[PDB]
Enzyme design. Sequence first.
Site, PDB file in Angstrom:
ATOM      1  N   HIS A  65      32.848  37.205  35.055  1.00 19.25           N
ATOM      2  CA  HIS A  65      31.999  36.727  33.986  1.00 19.25           C
ATOM      3  C   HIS A  65      32.572  35.477  33.373  1.00 19.25           C
ATOM      4  O   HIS A  65      33.788  35.282  33.226  1.00 19.25           O
ATOM      5  CB  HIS A  65      31.880  37.817  32.923  1.00 19.25           C
ATOM      6  CG  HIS A  65      31.212  37.432  31.678  1.00 19.25           C
ATOM      7  ND1 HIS A  65      29.877  37.029  31.581  1.00 19.25           N
ATOM      8  CD2 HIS A  65      31.647  37.435  30.407  1.00 19.25           C
ATOM      9  CE1 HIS A  65      29.563  36.816  30.308  1.00 19.25           C
ATOM     10  NE2 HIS A  65      30.599  37.067  29.559  1.00 19.25           N
ATOM     11  N   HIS A  67      32.648  33.784  30.153  1.00 21.29           N
ATOM     12  CA  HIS A  67      32.464  34.257  28.798  1.00 21.29           C
ATOM     13  C   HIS A  67      32.005  33.188  27.871  1.00 21.29           C
ATOM     14  O   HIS A  67      32.713  32.207  27.630  1.00 21.29           O
ATOM     15  CB  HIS A  67      33.770  34.927  28.311  1.00 21.29           C
ATOM     16  CG  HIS A  67      33.691  35.446  26.938  1.00 21.29           C
ATOM     17  ND1 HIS A  67      33.845  36.778  26.598  1.00 21.29           N
ATOM     18  CD2 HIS A  67      33.427  34.757  25.775  1.00 21.29           C
ATOM     19  CE1 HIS A  67      33.672  36.842  25.260  1.00 21.29           C
ATOM     20  NE2 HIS A  67      33.423  35.648  24.762  1.00 21.29           N
ATOM     21  N   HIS A 110      36.767  35.982  33.236  1.00 23.48           N
ATOM     22  CA  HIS A 110      37.528  37.225  33.406  1.00 23.48           C
ATOM     23  C   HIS A 110      36.770  38.172  34.281  1.00 23.48           C
ATOM     24  O   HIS A 110      35.547  38.162  34.378  1.00 23.48           O
ATOM     25  CB  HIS A 110      37.843  37.845  31.996  1.00 23.48           C
ATOM     26  CG  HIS A 110      36.653  38.203  31.147  1.00 23.48           C
ATOM     27  ND1 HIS A 110      35.928  39.335  31.327  1.00 23.48           N
ATOM     28  CD2 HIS A 110      36.137  37.603  30.032  1.00 23.48           C
ATOM     29  CE1 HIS A 110      35.022  39.417  30.343  1.00 23.48           C
ATOM     30  NE2 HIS A 110      35.109  38.380  29.511  1.00 23.48           N
ATOM     31  N   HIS A 112      34.888  41.401  35.156  1.00 29.46           N
ATOM     32  CA  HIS A 112      33.985  42.236  34.353  1.00 29.46           C
ATOM     33  C   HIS A 112      33.628  43.491  35.126  1.00 29.46           C
ATOM     34  O   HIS A 112      32.494  43.974  35.079  1.00 29.46           O
ATOM     35  CB  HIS A 112      32.757  41.435  33.891  1.00 29.46           C
ATOM     36  CG  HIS A 112      32.258  41.815  32.552  1.00 29.46           C
ATOM     37  ND1 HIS A 112      32.036  43.105  32.103  1.00 29.46           N
ATOM     38  CD2 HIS A 112      31.966  41.034  31.481  1.00 29.46           C
ATOM     39  CE1 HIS A 112      31.646  43.057  30.825  1.00 29.46           C
ATOM     40  NE2 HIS A 112      31.589  41.822  30.405  1.00 29.46           N
ATOM     41  N   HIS A 397      37.131  46.225  15.708  1.00 31.43           N
ATOM     42  CA  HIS A 397      36.463  46.012  17.007  1.00 31.43           C
ATOM     43  C   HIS A 397      35.839  44.643  17.091  1.00 31.43           C
ATOM     44  O   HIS A 397      34.960  44.331  16.271  1.00 31.43           O
ATOM     45  CB  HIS A 397      35.397  47.068  17.235  1.00 31.43           C
ATOM     46  CG  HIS A 397      35.917  48.453  17.174  1.00 31.43           C
ATOM     47  ND1 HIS A 397      36.600  49.019  18.249  1.00 31.43           N
ATOM     48  CD2 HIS A 397      35.794  49.388  16.208  1.00 31.43           C
ATOM     49  CE1 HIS A 397      36.927  50.237  17.869  1.00 31.43           C
ATOM     50  NE2 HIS A 397      36.473  50.493  16.665  1.00 31.43           N
ATOM     51  N   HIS A 400      30.976  41.465  21.113  1.00 26.57           N
ATOM     52  CA  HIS A 400      30.555  40.278  21.839  1.00 26.57           C
ATOM     53  C   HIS A 400      29.206  40.506  22.478  1.00 26.57           C
ATOM     54  O   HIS A 400      28.923  41.588  23.002  1.00 26.57           O
ATOM     55  CB  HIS A 400      31.584  39.952  22.914  1.00 26.57           C
ATOM     56  CG  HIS A 400      31.154  38.929  23.906  1.00 26.57           C
ATOM     57  ND1 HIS A 400      30.810  37.637  23.566  1.00 26.57           N
ATOM     58  CD2 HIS A 400      31.023  38.995  25.239  1.00 26.57           C
ATOM     59  CE1 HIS A 400      30.454  36.992  24.677  1.00 26.57           C
ATOM     60  NE2 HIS A 400      30.594  37.791  25.726  1.00 26.57           N
ATOM     61  N   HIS A 402      26.628  38.863  25.363  1.00 23.16           N
ATOM     62  CA  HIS A 402      26.413  37.918  26.462  1.00 23.16           C
ATOM     63  C   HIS A 402      25.073  37.159  26.225  1.00 23.16           C
ATOM     64  O   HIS A 402      24.180  37.602  25.508  1.00 23.16           O
ATOM     65  CB  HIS A 402      26.284  38.680  27.780  1.00 23.16           C
ATOM     66  CG  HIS A 402      27.531  39.351  28.266  1.00 23.16           C
ATOM     67  ND1 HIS A 402      27.801  39.392  29.604  1.00 23.16           N
ATOM     68  CD2 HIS A 402      28.587  39.971  27.679  1.00 23.16           C
ATOM     69  CE1 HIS A 402      28.942  40.067  29.777  1.00 23.16           C
ATOM     70  NE2 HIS A 402      29.468  40.395  28.624  1.00 23.16           N
ATOM     71  N   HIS A 452      28.979  44.498  23.612  1.00 24.02           N
ATOM     72  CA  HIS A 452      30.060  45.452  23.735  1.00 24.02           C
ATOM     73  C   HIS A 452      31.251  45.048  22.927  1.00 24.02           C
ATOM     74  O   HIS A 452      31.466  43.888  22.620  1.00 24.02           O
ATOM     75  CB  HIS A 452      30.453  45.665  25.212  1.00 24.02           C
ATOM     76  CG  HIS A 452      31.001  44.447  25.890  1.00 24.02           C
ATOM     77  ND1 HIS A 452      32.331  44.107  25.838  1.00 24.02           N
ATOM     78  CD2 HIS A 452      30.411  43.504  26.651  1.00 24.02           C
ATOM     79  CE1 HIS A 452      32.512  43.000  26.550  1.00 24.02           C
ATOM     80  NE2 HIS A 452      31.367  42.580  27.061  1.00 24.02           N
ATOM     81  N   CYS A 453      32.099  46.051  22.629  1.00 22.50           N
ATOM     82  CA  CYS A 453      33.421  45.732  22.097  1.00 22.50           C
ATOM     83  C   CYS A 453      34.249  45.076  23.188  1.00 22.50           C
ATOM     84  O   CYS A 453      34.227  45.527  24.341  1.00 22.50           O
ATOM     85  CB  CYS A 453      34.108  47.053  21.648  1.00 22.50           C
ATOM     86  SG  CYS A 453      35.729  46.634  20.923  1.00 22.50           S
ATOM     87  N   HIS A 454      34.983  44.021  22.842  1.00 25.32           N
ATOM     88  CA  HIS A 454      35.782  43.302  23.809  1.00 25.32           C
ATOM     89  C   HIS A 454      37.220  43.808  23.923  1.00 25.32           C
ATOM     90  O   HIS A 454      37.993  43.215  24.672  1.00 25.32           O
ATOM     91  CB  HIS A 454      35.754  41.793  23.514  1.00 25.32           C
ATOM     92  CG  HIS A 454      35.707  40.969  24.780  1.00 25.32           C
ATOM     93  ND1 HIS A 454      36.686  40.952  25.728  1.00 25.32           N
ATOM     94  CD2 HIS A 454      34.740  40.148  25.268  1.00 25.32           C
ATOM     95  CE1 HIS A 454      36.320  40.129  26.725  1.00 25.32           C
ATOM     96  NE2 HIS A 454      35.134  39.613  26.476  1.00 25.32           N
ATOM     97  N   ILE A 455      37.553  44.903  23.250  1.00 24.72           N
ATOM     98  CA  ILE A 455      38.769  45.645  23.589  1.00 24.72           C
ATOM     99  C   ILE A 455      38.407  46.384  24.881  1.00 24.72           C
ATOM    100  O   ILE A 455      37.532  47.274  24.884  1.00 24.72           O
ATOM    101  CB  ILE A 455      39.198  46.568  22.448  1.00 24.72           C
ATOM    102  CG1 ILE A 455      39.610  45.734  21.232  1.00 24.72           C
ATOM    103  CG2 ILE A 455      40.339  47.483  22.935  1.00 24.72           C
ATOM    104  CD1 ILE A 455      39.767  46.527  19.940  1.00 24.72           C
ATOM    105  N   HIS A 458      38.075  50.040  25.219  1.00 30.24           N
ATOM    106  CA  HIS A 458      36.948  50.622  24.509  1.00 30.24           C
ATOM    107  C   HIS A 458      35.646  50.441  25.290  1.00 30.24           C
ATOM    108  O   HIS A 458      34.819  51.353  25.307  1.00 30.24           O
ATOM    109  CB  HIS A 458      36.818  49.993  23.112  1.00 30.24           C
ATOM    110  CG  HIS A 458      37.985  50.221  22.229  1.00 30.24           C
ATOM    111  ND1 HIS A 458      38.033  49.652  20.962  1.00 30.24           N
ATOM    112  CD2 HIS A 458      39.111  50.945  22.445  1.00 30.24           C
ATOM    113  CE1 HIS A 458      39.187  50.056  20.448  1.00 30.24           C
ATOM    114  NE2 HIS A 458      39.860  50.829  21.298  1.00 30.24           N
ATOM    115  N   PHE A 463      31.864  51.766  24.861  1.00 28.80           N
ATOM    116  CA  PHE A 463      31.422  51.106  23.607  1.00 28.80           C
ATOM    117  C   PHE A 463      30.556  49.883  23.922  1.00 28.80           C
ATOM    118  O   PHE A 463      30.981  48.725  23.767  1.00 28.80           O
ATOM    119  CB  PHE A 463      32.627  50.751  22.754  1.00 28.80           C
ATOM    120  CG  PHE A 463      32.422  50.770  21.263  1.00 28.80           C
ATOM    121  CD1 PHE A 463      31.331  51.351  20.652  1.00 28.80           C
ATOM    122  CD2 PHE A 463      33.434  50.271  20.453  1.00 28.80           C
ATOM    123  CE1 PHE A 463      31.282  51.466  19.261  1.00 28.80           C
ATOM    124  CE2 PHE A 463      33.381  50.375  19.060  1.00 28.80           C
ATOM    125  CZ  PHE A 463      32.322  50.987  18.475  1.00 28.80           C
TER     126      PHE A 463
END
Length: 497
Positions: A65, A67, A110, A112, A397, A400, A402, A452-455, A458, A463
């Site tokens: 992806h 980002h 990164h 995905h 959290h 993000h 897309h 989604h959460c970018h941790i 998670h 998430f």
Amino acid sequence: AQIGPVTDLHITNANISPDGFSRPAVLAGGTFPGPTIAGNTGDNFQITVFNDLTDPSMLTDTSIHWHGLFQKGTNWADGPAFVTQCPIITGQSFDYNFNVPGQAGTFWYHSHLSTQYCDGLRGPFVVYDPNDPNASLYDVDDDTTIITLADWYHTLAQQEPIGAAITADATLINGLGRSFTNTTASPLSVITVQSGKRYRMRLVSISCDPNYLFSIDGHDMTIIEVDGVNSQQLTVDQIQIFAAQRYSFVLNANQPVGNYWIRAQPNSGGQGFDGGINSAILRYEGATVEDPTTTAPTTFSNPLVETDLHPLADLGVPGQPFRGGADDPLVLNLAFANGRFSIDGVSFVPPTVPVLLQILSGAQNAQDLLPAGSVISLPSNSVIEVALPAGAAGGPHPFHLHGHNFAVVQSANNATPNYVNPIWRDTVSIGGTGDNVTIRFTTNNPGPWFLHCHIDWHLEAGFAIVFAEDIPDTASANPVPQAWSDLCPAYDQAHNI
Ligand SMILES: *[C@@H]1O[C@H](CO)[C@@H](O[C@@H]2O[C@H](CO)[C@@H](O)[C@H](O)[C@H]2NC(C)=O)[C@H](O)[C@H]1NC(C)=O
Ligand SMILES: *[C@@H]1O[C@H](CO)[C@@H](O[C@@H]2O[C@H](CO)[C@@H](O)[C@H](O)[C@H]2NC(C)=O)[C@H](O)[C@H]1NC(C)=O
Ligand SMILES: [Cl-]
Ligand SMILES: [Cu+2]
Ligand SMILES: [Cu+2]
Ligand SMILES: [Cu+2]
């Protein structure tokens, strides 16, 4: 050197020791972080990704992806596995062929797929502006002014034990740093400046989890860009940067010639700087080659506060200036229990058929789309508001979206919304218990866009949801190349699905 906008990019396994500890990794371009992919605003990127992975301990499939790039008309190129494509299988390649109209700034790329980016597939992605309105604020802006902040783990991502807490083993700045335990005096990164010059430092969090308190002893930092969005100048002496966020700041090399500590304190893992953890070196030309002797203050004078940021352009806020003042106002119930996250009661588990492919095959409402309850339709040409009230464990959290940036109508730790001039960005901390971080955007980009959460731990634990934006126009807006159509049959055959 930077690569692109037309380039091959090979994804391989290799051993690396960025903190002195050797482990295998998943790498783009043979390095951690991967090479910078770059071009100019409006360019056609054609990134032919060669999956050469052979070690199943980090997954031999992959998907990449880009980002923060909107992918308008090219949703198939966005990269989230089982949202916009099936993964690329080993021994195959795939051309991510897209354009970046109307965007210029600091991005990243990164994996995905699962938690694979934690295993090393992460790098910067810069879209320069030949007519940048900020150009006169600095002298130097090139590969030497990119600063990446990364968490690094000794345990492989797939091998993190169920039921045990996940924390990193080192902070890496430009790919180097020292381990929190069994610290050895492995090399630190050096960022070199010339006295009197001004630098556009492009600060990129490539984190899988922690946020960092970033500072540079003796210096301050004038923010000019937030997640791709030009800002008014905002001078700070510390930046709390959450996973996947970016800032550009002007660094004025206006201190005595010498060595200065660069500090990146994660919110978990090693606290402080003993042995040179959480550190890099700012070195002026002509300085002695030795470690800095500077200290941080006890208390920073001018930390970044998100509500202090404002766009350089007159971006405003879409909709009406009150809560719910949108065509499609949403409030998500974000929760965690028993190892899994949920959004409106549904924990995200990736579907067998990518959401985009389900839509192209004729599924035409969100109740028809899998995973059931994880896909929410958005209407076209509409103002969307999404309130994201915090409270779920594991915060803060960084959420993000897309396909979009968004106005941050309400920020962490401040109950007052801003319907006039808040910053726009693409990844936002939702803050702490009782907060009501809220975003707005307009729906002018048909396709399924992950929220989604970018941790990454998670995301893996559920998430996320998918916004199926303008289902009716998704097929006409996003013609797909044959190579994309070939991905799922190849993947499913390789995996006996
Ligand atoms: C966050 O803001 C949203 C609105 O953007 C609030 O949503 C309202 O919630 C109440 C019940 O809590 C409902 O009666 C309304 O229909 C919702 N929309 C409105 C008023 O516009 C939400 O309560 C806020 N959450 C927190 C935790 O402050
Ligand atoms: C909390 O957030 C609000 C809204 O973004 C901030 O209020 C703005 O403050 C600026 C600076 O004084 C004023 O120019 C604006 O008129 C305010 N807008 C609104 C809607 O009130 C506020 O400063 C933030 N609080 C802190 C402590 O930073
Ligand atoms: Cl994105
Ligand atoms: Cu993204
Ligand atoms: Cu999270
Ligand atoms: Cu994502």
